[PDB]
Amino acid sequence: MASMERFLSVYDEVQAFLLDQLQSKYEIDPNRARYLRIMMDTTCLGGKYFRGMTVVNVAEGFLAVTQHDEATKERILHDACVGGWMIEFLQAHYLVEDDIMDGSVMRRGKPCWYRFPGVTTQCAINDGIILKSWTQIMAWHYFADRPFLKDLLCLFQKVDYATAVGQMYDVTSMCDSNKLDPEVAQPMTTDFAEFTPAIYKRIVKYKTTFYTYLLPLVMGLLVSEAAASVEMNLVERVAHLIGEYFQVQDDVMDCFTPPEQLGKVGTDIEDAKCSWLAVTFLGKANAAQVAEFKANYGEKDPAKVAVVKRLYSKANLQADFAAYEAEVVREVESLIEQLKVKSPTFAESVAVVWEKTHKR
């Protein structure tokens, strides 16, 4: 079976399980089951599934070099798919709640979930809650007897928590730290002294890289019982490196990729986000360029946004991006080499992850 066909079929299985359980144990009625089915589909489907399919791809790499009965190969692939869906549902949770938090308009060429007419924020917050609850239901049901259940749940929790910490770092990135205070409405920074590479790296590390790269990789290992074919410190280093890059790309596309192509109108400039573009601009700007950035950043006025975009283009950030990209390629190749020492197989999956990221 091709991997994607298998992955999508398990989605239907998992869906039917969750909805059937709601009828047999939770007293749901058909109409609310239908609401949840449509919520699930709308929030979990339609992306490229690279998080969830990474779990599958890691597990397939190990299958090709490990002796197993056919039943065991099927069981391992089924587990990789369920694990993959846990990650996809965890992302769906994030995206639902983030969209509400940020007052987002579109996601993937469609309205954000909370903006559907029959949803509203009042339901959507709870819908996002359920999305994450379903990850746990999956794990407890499908992995009940599995030796990796404990490690998998613990890993999941830590990644989840890192992710929520990262959302806090992200939504607070345009405040001055010493001014954070729940009793006082938070002004945007005037100095941008916290728009640094180290601070940007901290935001992106927690908000994206743990769930997008570390979790799929380590889940692949756990469902394969292969965590001893790797030096976990290298797996973390390479996840954080590739994850940072992925985010830098995301940050550039927010500003420069056409809305029709991005699936949304990017608003990082208006939201005063600590983006790669802002940090890199401030790292090379002269005093006049910095003053014009401060007078125009974080404003809804389209004229000021166009002025920030012009400031980025004139500063030739595409060159800083190339240099960044070169250094990442260098370091990713290095870590892949270090990973070959203990597992060629896992190194190869990491190469594939890098290819999918670098060439998207």
Ligand X SMILES: COc1ccc(-c2cc[nH]n2)c(O)c1
Phi–psi pair at 199, nearest 5 degrees: -75, -45
- Among 208, 212, 224, 343, interactor with ligand X by CB under 6 A: 212
**Residue 312 near which of a second copy, Zn ion, ligand X, none (CB within 5-8 Å, type-dependent):** ligand X
Cβ–Cβ under 8 Å, residues 178 and 190: no
Of 10-18, 168-176, 326-334, 349-357: span binding ligand X (CB under 6 A): 349-357
349 binds ligand X (CB under 6 A): no
Let me know how long the chain is.
Answer: 360
Structure-token match 């308009």, residue found: 105
R_g over Cα of the chain: 22
Residues 2-61 that bind a second copy (CB under 8 A): 22, 26-29, 31-32, 34-35, 38-39, 42
Q: Residue 290: helix, strand or coil by DSSP?
A: helix
Q: Binding string, 94-113, against Zn ion, x = CB under 5 A?
A: ----x---x-----------
Contact between 82 and 219 (Cβ < 8 Å): no
Nearer to ligand X, 84 or 128 (CB): 84
Taking each helix axis from N to C terminus, what angle separates 215-223 and 344-358, rounded to the nearest 10 degrees?
150
302 binds a second copy (CB under 8 A): no
Q: What are the CA-CA distances from residue 231 to residues 94, 157, 218, 234, 342 (Å)?
A: 29, 21, 11, 6, 8
Q: Which stretch binds ligand X (CB under 6 A): 92-100, 137-145, 151-159, 317-325?
A: 317-325
29 makes contact, choosing from a second copy, ligand X, Zn ion, none, with CB < 5 to 8 Å by partner type, with a second copy
Site for a second copy in 145-164 (CB under 8 A): 150, 153-154, 157, 160-162, 164
Question: Least distance to Zn ion from the beta carbon of 170, Å?
Answer: 6
Return the range that interacts with ligand X (CB under 6 A); candidates 92-100, 211-219, 230-238, 300-308.
211-219
173 binds, among Zn ion, ligand X, a second copy, none (CB under 5 to 8 A by kind): none
Of 236, 178, 242, 175, nearest in space to 204 by CA: 242
Check the chain for breaks (C–N over 2.5 Å) and list the residue before each, or none.
Answer: none
What sign does the CA torsion over 274, 278, 280, 286 have? negative
191 labelled binding-site residue: no
In order of 105, 261, 338, the CA distances from 111 in angstroms are 6, 15, 44
d(CA 72, CA 54): 19
Residues 6 or more apart whose CB falls under 8 angstroms from that of 243 comprise 204, 205, 208, 209, 210, 212, 213, 214
Residue 313 in contact with ligand X, rule: CB under 6 A: yes
Instruction: Say if CB 124 and CB 114 are below 8 A apart.
Output: yes
Q: Interaction with a second copy in 203-242: which residues (CB under 8 A)?
A: 205-206
Q: Is 250 annotated as a binding residue?
A: yes
Residues in touch with a second copy (CB under 8 A):
22, 26-29, 31-32, 34-35, 38-39, 42, 97, 100-103, 116-119, 121-123, 125-127, 129-130, 133-134, 136-137, 140, 150, 153-154, 157, 160-162, 164-165, 167-169, 171-172, 177-186, 202, 205-206
Output the known binding site for Mn(2+).
98, 102, 170, 250, 254
Residues in touch with ligand X (CB under 6 A):
48, 50-51, 54, 212-213, 216, 252, 256, 312-313, 317-318, 321, 353, 356-357, 360
